[PDB]
């Protein structure tokens, strides 16, 4: 009988031995998955320079999350960065008082919120977006006047109910000089 065995020894994913017929152009900056030279992953792409050795191939980092991709055809270097993520909190008054609420996302920017049933589309784009260092809460009006701390939000912000939910900086009590 004729038998052939193969060594394999899978330790380095971006190598030179692969011939899939699929070909696609390179993406500069899009929050999309990548499959360059057999290496899979997700994140956003960003171009930068690094003193990489020529004979070497790629660079892996903590938790074996590679931060570099090289084009087999054209010689250039790009860096990767994982996508923005976080929880979403809901700021509500008493359920019997009213039904309207104001969500608060975690440490994310207001730009990518719309990207990430018909009533749910309203909160995506946002008509009263408030940007705060604790998070990007929407649906609550920002008032310059300050009040007592009713609902706890991070970094000295508090939301109350006056027929619309408002968000303000909490006051530390009435001032007085003896």
């Amino acid at each position: 009988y004729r038998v052939v065995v193969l060594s394999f020894e899978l330790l380095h994913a971006p190598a030179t031995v692969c011939g899939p017929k699929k070909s696609t152009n390179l993406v500069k900056n899009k929050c999309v998955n990548f499959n360059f030279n057999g290496l899979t992953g997700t994140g956003v792409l960003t171009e930068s320079n690094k003193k990489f050795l020529p004979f070497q191939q790629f660079g892996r980092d903590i938790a074996d999350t590679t931060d570099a991709v090289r084009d087999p055809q054209t010689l250039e270097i790009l860096d990767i960065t994982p996508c923005s993520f976080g929880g979403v909190s809901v700021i509500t008054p008493g359920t019997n008082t009213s039904n309207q609420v104001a969500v608060l996302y975690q440490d994310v920017n207001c730009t990518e919120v719309p990207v990430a049933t018909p009533t749910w589309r309203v909160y995506s784009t946002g008509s009263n977006v408030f940007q705060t260092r604790a998070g990007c809460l929407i649906g609550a009006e920002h008032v310059n006047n300050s009040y007592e701390c009713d609902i706890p939000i991070g970094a000295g912000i508090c939301a109350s109910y006056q027929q619309s939910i408002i968000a303000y900086t909490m006051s530390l009590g009435a001032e007085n000089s003896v």
């Binding site: 009988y1 038998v3 052939v4 065995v5 060594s7 899978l10 031995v17 692969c18 899939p20 499959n35």
Partner: protein
């Protein structure tokens, strides 16, 4: 430094159990592996349990 082209393996018939995948499940001809060493040899073929 070649194209591998493992799709030819599914052709013909007979062969034997692969009994060696040992990575993870999804698609066959995507990963680039590390090194493809072919060491074809001919035995009596009485038992391949070795």
């Amino acid at each position: 430094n070649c194209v591998a082209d493992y799709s030819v393996l599914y052709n013909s018939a007979s062969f034997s159990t692969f009994k060696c995948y040992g990575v993870s499940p999804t698609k066959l001809n995507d990963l680039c592996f590390t090194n493809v060493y072919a060491d074809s040899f001919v035995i009596r073929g009485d038992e391949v349990r070795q």
